[PDB]
Amino acid sequence: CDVLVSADWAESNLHAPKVVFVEVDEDTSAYDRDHIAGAIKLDWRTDLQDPVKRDFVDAQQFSKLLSERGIANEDTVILYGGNNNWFAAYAYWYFKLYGHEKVKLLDGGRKKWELDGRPLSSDPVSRPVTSYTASPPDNTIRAFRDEVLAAINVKNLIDVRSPDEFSGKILAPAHLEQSQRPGHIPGAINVPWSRAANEDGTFKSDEELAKLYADAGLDNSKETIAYCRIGERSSHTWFVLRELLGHQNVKNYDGSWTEYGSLVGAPIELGS
């Protein structure tokens, strides 16, 4: 597509003119041993987040980051990674946020790739520094708490966590604590991100996708906001709704539940 590429296409374009392959994951230890030939790495925690404030980097920082890494405005960017391509989808969203036009996701991420047995490289990579200039933030695709609060009833609210997180039965996936209140935003619909993807990690057809979200009760006549626990899994769904099925107004609530379930006085709904 114009926003998605297949492993085959990727394989056959490893070293094509103005095309940069970038690996995104929250750890980056996977890249420091095996990665697509020519690929560079962005560490989600250490490169894309603020060191002090609960926030991701701003325009000026984003520009210095990409410059230092050799990404140019006119490059076509291919994103891919582990953890079900979650953070690749998070990066995809950061990119669109700062106005990058030619950005494409790699269907399946680092997991379809490894499964097809495609060649990986362990050779260090460094590109000549560029002169990248980000656009001021496009908040048409970002939701902040207040507008998240102001929604409720007004908008499709899509909770992409697991059912047990959604119902409030559990606070977080499997590892530990996150807010201090369990549950979801009143009115919210539970489509665990996972349903939008095949066993191998690739996105499902627009036919399967429309069905999935129709069945769950997504109101096509309403504007939509997606949320997760840390925006993690929500930017993956955002990409699905806006980029694949092409809804016009879809925001990612990056704050997600870690913020929401910690706000005092905010409405909450238990159960399913």
What would you call the quaternary organization?
monomer
Number of distinct helices: 9
Tally the beta strands: 9
CATH-defined superfamily of the largest domain: Rhodanese-like domain
In CATH, the topology of the largest domain is named Oxidized Rhodanese, domain 1
Across the major sheet, the strand order is 1-5-4-2-3
What characteristic shape results from the CA principal axes?
Answer: globular
The topology string of helices and strands comes to EHEEHEHEHHEHEHEHEH
Give helix % range. Answer: 25-40%
Q: How many structural domains are formed by the residues?
A: 2
CATH architecture heading of the largest domain: 3-Layer(aba) Sandwich
**Strand count, sense and closure of the main sheet?**
5 strands, parallel
Strand % is: 5-15%
Query: Which class do the helix and strand fractions yield?
Result: alpha/beta
The level-1 CATH class of the largest domain: Alpha Beta
EC number: 2.8.1.1
Protein name: Putative thiosulfate sulfurtransferase
Organism: Mycobacterium tuberculosis (strain CDC 1551 / Oshkosh)
GO molecular function: thiosulfate-cyanide sulfurtransferase activity
